[PDB]
Design a protein around this ligand. Sequence first.
Ligand SMILES: Nc1nc2ccccc2[nH]1
Ligand SMILES: [Mg+2]
Length: 188
Amino acid sequence: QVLEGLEAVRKRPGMYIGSTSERGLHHLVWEIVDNSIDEALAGYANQIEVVIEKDNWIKVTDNGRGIPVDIQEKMGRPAVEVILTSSVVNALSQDLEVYVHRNETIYHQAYKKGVPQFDLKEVGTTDKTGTVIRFKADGEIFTETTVYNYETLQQRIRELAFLNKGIQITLRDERDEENVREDSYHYE
Ligand SMILES: Nc1nc2ccccc2[nH]1
Ligand SMILES: [Mg+2]
């Protein structure tokens, strides 16, 4: 059960993500980015964008197939809900949002500490496929710092692009609207 899983992750977060230090905070980004890379290596995505948003929200966008939304056999819930309510990133985020572009439709769900706040809802239409995940790390868990280091993200994003040639991976810092930094990596 999903609620018992959320309890277990939040009780011993370091056993899942290594630590709750600044290292563990950045690990949240890598968990999400690794899923986008998996989708690229499977043959379905080639562009990943990581944005550090105002108040240290992280937004990760990919142009994969979109996390499936079909009503699943096990849970009787949309697949995306099942997948995200078992995500360690969701459990350790005070807030998380997903937008799935799939079936020419945009689907949205939001969560707090892993708990869905409402049922998956159709919010719009689209001519693309892919997934947007936005999350705010839980300061109750990450007690040292919740502020991302641009250089730390940049170094690993550049490395990921070099290791997975053909994937365009972009990093953008929007925390200061007057001074926005972007680096874009695409190895050939
Ligand atoms: N593309 C993608 N990104 C994801 C993030 C969390 C769970 C599944 C995912 N699939
Ligand atoms: Mg994964």
